[PDB]
Amino acid sequence: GVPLRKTIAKNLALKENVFMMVVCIELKIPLFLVGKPGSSKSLAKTIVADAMQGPAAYSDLFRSLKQVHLVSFQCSPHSTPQGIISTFRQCARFQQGKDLQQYVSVVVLDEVGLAEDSPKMPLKTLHPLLEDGCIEDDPAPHKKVGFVGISNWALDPAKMNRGIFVSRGSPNETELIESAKGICSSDILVQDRVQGYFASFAKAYETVCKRQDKEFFGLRDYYSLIKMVFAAAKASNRKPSPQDIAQAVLRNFSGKDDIQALDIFLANLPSEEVSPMQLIKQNIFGPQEDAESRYLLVLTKNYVALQILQQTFFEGDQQPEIIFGSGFPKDQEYTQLCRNINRVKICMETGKMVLLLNLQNLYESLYDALNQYYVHLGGQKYVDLGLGTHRVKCRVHPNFRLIVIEEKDVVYKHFPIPLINRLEKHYLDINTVLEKWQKSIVEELCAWVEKFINVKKRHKYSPSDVFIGYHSDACASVVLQVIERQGPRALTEELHQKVSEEAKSILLNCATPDAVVRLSAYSLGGFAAEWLSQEYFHRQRHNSFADFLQAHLHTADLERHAIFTEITTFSRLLTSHDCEILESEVTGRAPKPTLLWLQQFDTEYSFLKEVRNCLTNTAKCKILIFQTDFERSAQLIASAKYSVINEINKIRENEDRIFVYFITKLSRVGRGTAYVGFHGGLWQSVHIDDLRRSTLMVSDVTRLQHVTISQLFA
């Protein structure tokens, strides 16, 4: 009677849970459900809610049953009894002035076990509430409400008001095979074609669950593998190939190091190769049909995955929207959660991909949105989003994908297991994208750098003192940017040489003139030192920001309408006078370059308003300059970068070119944290010692190399 997606496992667990939920809601029996993630608890919740809508039910069975209104409340270790009390009071109010024989309100407590031994002891209030709905106030009929407590963690029966408690255990091989068949029940031909691998998959899943230390993998991964194989065989109209099984396995059983998931799964079989890049592409741009895949949980180190994604997958106007924790001084509150959820919902409605980078706090609000348990209305699917007590169904566009970027350690340590199991995991670092020759190039570059720094040389410098913003993954990001810019061209000796040289140049572009002069000197001249000096003082532009801007405007990618440059300097930041000089210099090409100071904005909305006022203009070439004085400034800089990118994406309407220059002032010595650059992706990193025009010394340096202090006065 209730409508269900064909790919849903009509297994014993779901049936039993739905039966029990319906009965205990119609009769108001406290029902507690416990089971590992994927035990069909929340799915049963959504199905039960969408089923017994009352007169609006899909079947005559539920048209003769009480109408249900859920009031969900995610229990956490930080919960308080007041949360449960307010939830029960809200449910009662919903029941106030209604025919309790044709309407019932249900308090749904998710993750009850999280609050079992909480010091605040919130569950101590369930016993009275479950009894009469009133702690101390007088009882009443509309206060007695239904209760469903879903948990993936163990519970104490003494806190259940001696209600019904259903603890489901880890299913067995035959249960897994039966579920796999229920998933493939849509087509019997494909079901028969794939039925051979069910036992092998179940055995491999049990082996993985045993081997793994923490419950990283779960039932949802097995089910997603079965669905992938089923859809592959259905689209192929033929027995699944080894490469299909491999793709599915590595799409659903990847993300951990200990578990290989391939040698375990095959174990009787050969396919050839598939990289996490292809897997992420399949998740985002997978080949009417409910062939929907879970959301991604890209793990990485130092957030390189963000730049890899920005440069590799989406490079046109299809860019996603980045949700991030505002690093501004005053925008650190729950209003940030509200804004981020609004943006998530707007993207869901519109079909824009989403990138969560630091939002693990937005999981009490997206919990049900990641389960992918949809309810439909007219061919459109709706999933529950939430803010505090508020929880409502938001539409989901088919083209909507979500990508979570986080650090491997943060995930393995603080991420809740169900959140992991709700997502498709994959590890993405530079090494996972680079081939062998490129890694050798990285090593050659590290060596060439250590030479550059010190030749033969009385002082000992560090690469961060010569290459501003240098860090561990600098040359790696350089080579990645290089190969991504080149295209898909294959290996070649000439290509190796070209990559090495282009990386050398890109690194030098963030070097100091002192360094190249030192190299020319301590090398007593030399072909290499002089070639680099030429590249630095003649081919490139570091004498001032105006010359760099001229070169960029004259040699900017025509196709790309947004160029992002991260500049670093030691001199004083620009001012109205420098902006006026630039305007007088860029006349006819671009209007007055807008200049902004991140330290002047106390909130992200003010920054966004300014960026929009600057972008709302009709100029065909808009130059934006965001100046900061490093001295928690990295968080602000990154937040501003993400905001600028998102805003430029929202106004991706024409071919108007948008140049962006983040200018960070640094100290040649330092006074604290170390500045980190080479963020790669869509970010040309540059170092300009002094941005001014050198009125006093109008000479381009490398001219005082052929002049004495005496000839200056001649």
Add this chain to the structure above:
Amino acid sequence: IEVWRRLVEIQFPAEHGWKESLLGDMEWRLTKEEPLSQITAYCNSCWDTKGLEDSVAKTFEKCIIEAVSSACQSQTSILQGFSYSDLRKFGIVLSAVITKSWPRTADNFDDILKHLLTLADVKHVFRLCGTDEKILANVTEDAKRLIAVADSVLTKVVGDLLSGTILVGQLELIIKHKNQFLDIWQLREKSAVEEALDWRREELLLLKKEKRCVDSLLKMCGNVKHLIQVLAVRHSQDLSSKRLNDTVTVRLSTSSNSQRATHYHLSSQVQEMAGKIDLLRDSHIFQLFWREELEEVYDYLYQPSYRKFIKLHQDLKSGEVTLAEIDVIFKDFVNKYTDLDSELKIMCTVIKDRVEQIKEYHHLHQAVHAAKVILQVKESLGLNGDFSVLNTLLNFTDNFDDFRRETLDQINQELIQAKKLLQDISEARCKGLQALSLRKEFICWVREALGGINELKVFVDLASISAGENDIDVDRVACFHDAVQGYASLLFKLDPSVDFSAFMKHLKKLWKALDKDQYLPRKLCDSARNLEWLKTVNESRSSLTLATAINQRGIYVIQAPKGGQKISPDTVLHLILPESPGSHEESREYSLEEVKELLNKLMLMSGKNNTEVERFSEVFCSVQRLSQAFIDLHSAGNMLFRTWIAMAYCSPKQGVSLQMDFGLDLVTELKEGGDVTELLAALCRQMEHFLD
């Protein structure tokens, strides 16, 4: 080179770094060039007639060796079409090649074999060595030792092959690289195997075929494992490192044709059974027949199912198959004409549109369904024209049990025409008409209330007022709107006495209405679900309207808590919403909790240009910041703000945007206009500086 030699040989004290720096510069000038060009120069350009002892030549050779190492780690062969004028330099290059290209674990027969069978440089060096013997003198003793172990590997592989004692892995790789292996063998020998390789290939193919037949046998029984529970040990054995003559009886020059008893020693009966189950493992029909322990699976399970299958095949080729187990079998091939044609083609081991009968038969069944649905719609829309033309097909199931014994073309003649009368009706259209027929009260209510499409918009507008300010509640209108628009032909402008012909000519409109939006039936059904709310719309605020009103007139009041209440944003801050001029409302008062609930609503609402929401959130955040500053000052013991009240007007009221009163005699009432957010930010900065 003359200049570099002259300069480097100047016998400066070695503790100064003259030769070092000069040679570094020369190496830099060299490395720039493509490594291939470097090697071509080192090998052909005449520059070493004055001995190679000079450090110049040593550095050149070092750079060339690095180049060769890189290009070998590139697996891009170098010696292809390579010309040499010097044999010493070319020998150095060849030795570097043989050494670097060699695997870094070059003691494993397997890696060495794959390396000499895959890489091409090996072929070229073997060919050169076989053609010219002088180049060998120019080869290093290390490369010579490598060549020797390579020739030993080849001799061992050939002894095996011609003898039949080879590992399955080596033989597989050799067959994969048969050409390269043969060529290297001919080249080295110049300083049988073909027929041997062919025989070993046949043996390997036979072994793999037996393995595959066994795998099919196992997978077949693997289907009933949920009902009924050595060969596994053998078939599980990793053949990769097993010996051929052990598994399969290799045909050497020792004996001519002879049956090959493989690792299993299958009884020819099991051999035939396995061949059958293997050529029939891809048969869904056999997969079903397999459904009704140790062996005896032959005639307890396999033979009954197989004889039933052969009888079924004979009937297929005859057309005598009956309809009953036709329905039981081909139920899964509906709309799968390709799967069915292949399941037939596989039966010609010993017609194409003979099975069309089944196909047509399926259509007939579908028609019946459609017919029933049509009847239902005739009752739902209350038609009157005659529709008993399908009652024949209605009594089809009143004749099912008597029809099944009627074989296929023996089915009947009459329906052969009725099928063509409903052949146009697809299953999707059947579902549309089904959604229409299941719902009757909704149809009557629609005919009554609206009466016509022109009355729809008005209704829709009203529905938009009482939708509910959210996604599903708002979409409930677009649904039932697209519905009344698509199902209009059958709801309003249909004559109640239009029989089959006119009825189909009318449904010609619903055809397009559906092909435009394939979700129309879902919309109609979800509307019929919402009949109560639609009637509610007929018989007759929002968070966005409230937010707009707050922006236009709201006044955020920051105060010191009264009644000794604790100091907290809930106690310090509260919003006042004055009634609009003339409106029967009053000056409502909202707490912080209510404001933030309204904010959550605005964030999660339909949102179908977030201008008012943005201003609301901005002003709310500014006021919260101001309240926190006031609280912090209060905690620090500041007595000035004890009686301080601030009223921030979300919109300028009489030119006043912000107002402050310390409740004192000296300090008069302060007030200022302009933008509330900038002013509040300045005030908060000032209050924070004052706190410090």
